[PDB]
Design a protein around this ligand. Sequence first.
Ligand SMILES: *[C@@H]1O[C@H](CO)[C@@H](O[C@@H]2O[C@H](CO)[C@@H](O[C@@H]3O[C@H](CO)[C@@H](O)[C@H](O)[C@@H]3O)[C@H](O)[C@H]2NC(C)=O)[C@H](O)[C@H]1NC(C)=O
Ligand SMILES: *[C@@H]1O[C@H](CO)[C@@H](O)[C@H](O)[C@H]1NC(C)=O
Ligand SMILES: CO[C@H]1O[C@H](CO)[C@H](O)[C@H](O)[C@H]1O
Lengths: 247, 261
Amino acid sequence: NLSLSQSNFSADTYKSFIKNLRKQLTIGASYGSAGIPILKHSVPICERFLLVDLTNGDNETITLAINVEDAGFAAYRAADRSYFFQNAPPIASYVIFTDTNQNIMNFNNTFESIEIVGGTTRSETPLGIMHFEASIFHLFVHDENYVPTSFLVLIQMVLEAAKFKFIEQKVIHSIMDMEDFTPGLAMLSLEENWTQLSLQLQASESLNGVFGDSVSLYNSMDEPIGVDSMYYPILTANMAFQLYQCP
Amino acid sequence: NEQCSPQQRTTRISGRDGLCVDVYGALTADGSRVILYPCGQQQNQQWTFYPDNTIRSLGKCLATSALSSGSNVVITNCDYLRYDDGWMVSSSGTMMNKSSHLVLTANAATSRTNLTGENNVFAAKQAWRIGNYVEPIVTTIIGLRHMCLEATDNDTNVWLESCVKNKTKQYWALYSDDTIRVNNNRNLCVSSSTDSSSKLIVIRRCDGSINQRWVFTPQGTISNPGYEAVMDVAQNDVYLKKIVLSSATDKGNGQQWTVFY
Ligand SMILES: *[C@@H]1O[C@H](CO)[C@@H](O[C@@H]2O[C@H](CO)[C@@H](O[C@@H]3O[C@H](CO)[C@@H](O)[C@H](O)[C@@H]3O)[C@H](O)[C@H]2NC(C)=O)[C@H](O)[C@H]1NC(C)=O
Ligand SMILES: *[C@@H]1O[C@H](CO)[C@@H](O)[C@H](O)[C@H]1NC(C)=O
Ligand SMILES: CO[C@H]1O[C@H](CO)[C@H](O)[C@H](O)[C@H]1O
């Protein structure tokens, strides 16, 4: 299983962790004219999950199961226990963490579902080394009070980081500088539009690299940049892979 | 999903010095000329793309004038071009005529310069951003050891320095002609060496050349597609204070860059 531990922790190993995560998610990826790998689709369940271990400084480890179709967490296993999002694939119980005491969390793996139940948004939830550590702990013990926020932390710091090199860079700066941050409009607008960008970018094969609809990505000055084509370096040199949307 | 096959999109096209592709005078008739003009909201800068590989303003298609290089680019009646394979726009922003291989080009930066069909050499004058947002994208450029490209020696050289938030000379403007420019002085462009003996990347006065055309690839390189090479840190050592042009290679991390905007 791919791993990121607190012992071997730095900007460089985090960068390496994300590279290998991207690489393994994009095994067998399709490619278009944009050259941004598209994730696999209609994957047999028995091979639809990529397992990733995370370990804090107190050597408490959780294994997260990433759906390789959409690069979102379906479940995680701590010790002999495991916890599944109620929108994880129905058969996921029979393929992963089979040798565990399995539980169902009463919310979906989406930011919307997690924020509603957690009672807290991503912009109120700080990100950094300390919060990565706490998240691993709170998930390992499964303190229900902190399970929602812990996923907001780790979904962003691992998966959205994998999805977007800009987000990866925000986490690199936070690790390097030992400076926590809450995400702003730039980071959130990428997360909001990963699925929309995937659709439009694959739809653009039809129209010479031009999108069916515009996508508003914000910059660090809170200025909305409208991406209606593949000819923006903030998309093209940012997004690492896509959701399968079009044949 | 019907959104996988969108039937049309109206956008703008901006290139050399951030100026837009413009039908001179908004003229209806066949052979009406197409020019480099300051960007605006007018109808004759609106360009509608279609599945049949046409690009249309005023209800008429964009087209090259002649078979050989040199001649203008014009709008003409579409029916003229219904059994023509039309334009292909490459990954870099090179807009090419399929059958002829001629590419959309701006031989000068001046307002009302005639756009033309020339032989592709991947010059900055042949690079175009298809998009409604025509403004230069202000950003830092982070590379090896998580350090920023900084304009140095009165905007003549470029090398890596520790990133400092809001430090003027570490900010760069990415123009619709694939140029990387000093944000404090947008007459100046990052450039591959004009001297044949040096590979050292420099800052020089913008001139639309092949040296100044830079493509941020999805694989994390900054490519000069004309010279078939990428930006690289000299010997993977940032303290050498030299960024060079080198053939693409996976040995080291000196050719990896992030756009942080
Ligand atoms: C890309 O370039 C090619 C070649 O330069 C263009 O093909 C040319 O298109 C014109 C207009 O359809 C063709 O026109 C007709 O020629 C006859 C005489 O043969 C004339 O009587 C008609 O009034 C009309 O002008 C022309 O033959 C054709 N040339 C070739 C070599 O096929 C094409 O239009 C360009 N495409 C774009 C979108 O720029
Ligand atoms: C989770 O997603 C399912 C569809 O897969 C949806 O029916 C359900 O409403 C979502 N969760 C909640 C709490 O709404
Ligand atoms: C004076 O403006 C008009 O002509 C110029 C060229 O002279 C441009 O085509 C512009 O789009 C049009 O509105």
